Write a protein that binds this ligand. Structure first.
Ligand SMILES: [Zn+2]
Ligand SMILES: [Zn+2]
Ligand SMILES: [Zn+2]
Ligand SMILES: [Zn+2]
Ligand SMILES: [Zn+2]
Ligand SMILES: [Zn+2]
Ligand SMILES: [Zn+2]
Ligand SMILES: [Zn+2]
Ligand SMILES: [Zn+2]
Ligand SMILES: [Zn+2]
Ligand SMILES: [Zn+2]
Ligand SMILES: [Zn+2]
Lengths: 61, 60, 61, 60, 61, 61
RNA sequence: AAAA
């Protein structure tokens, strides 16, 4: 399972992820927790509850 | 369930939540009610029944 | 079920519901019928048969 | 099942239907057939096979 | 059903079909294979694996 | 019969240079490292991208 | 990221 091992790894290491949204929007932060439908991203120190259906890509480097 | 937990909590505390839509529209309001498919958001007094498929992000 | 209770109500009382679409379009009319997949809105001299997947929000003002 | 009955009506009577698409685009024609996932719309003398997921509204 | 019948005929006849995408883009080509979820389309000299969820319409010419 | 999983495994095994087109018109060239039912991991321009399939229109080779 |  690539999705979970990936999110798990982002979460455990607290890596700075860039999240790209379907509509073109992007946001950088840290994944704090996630389940099947949502991802909780801490960005600019503030919490965001994001639906996976709204997400295109997670990017890191 | 992370989703239900957060919605449960926004509702209990009648907190003013910002809801972003897929299309980039954004609406500010309080969660009154929600189910497996919809969110009820009171904004400027008026109720809005929103489908979850149309929602991008909740923030505060 | 929130959705199903709200639509039953819109329908029973013949309220002038405004429907917003995912792509931001906006339609205003009376809900005459609905099932798991579609809503039927008698708008301005036309019957509109709408898919729920295309709906963003119902409101009334 | 409002959907299937509506479509059966459109097909049986060859009623002029305007199909509106998610992206706002629109097309008028006669429904020649349909199944669970698609609608066969004849428009300007050409067959169109449309996915229901692409459709926002049917208007008559 | 309607779908499988149409795609099978596109495939067996090597019909040049136009694929319209949800975002308006369009591609012209021949259908090499398809399954429940994807359509393989030869177009502009290249191979394409298209998701049905992104397809809006097929038409011939 | 399962075109999608056959193609992805080929892309991964042969390290084919794949262009991923997204529903929102944007596109990304690279190589597939991992995929599963819901996501694809695409190495491109030095970056790891984790892309949701629901956000993908087409793979082009 | 405000449904013009
Ligand atoms: Zn969802
Ligand atoms: Zn409002
Ligand atoms: Zn839905
Ligand atoms: Zn924010
Ligand atoms: Zn109208
Ligand atoms: Zn639908
Ligand atoms: Zn046409
Ligand atoms: Zn579909
Ligand atoms: Zn799909
Ligand atoms: Zn990149
Ligand atoms: Zn998905
Ligand atoms: Zn191409």
């Amino acid at each position: 399972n690539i999705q979970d091992k990936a999110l798990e790894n982002f979460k455990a290491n607290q890596t700075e992820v860039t999240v790209f949204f379907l509509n073109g929007f992007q946001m950088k932060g840290v994944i704090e927790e996630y389940d099947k439908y949502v991802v909780s991203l801490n960005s600019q120190g503030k919490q965001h509850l994001i639906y996976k259906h709204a997400i295109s890509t997670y990017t890191v480097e």
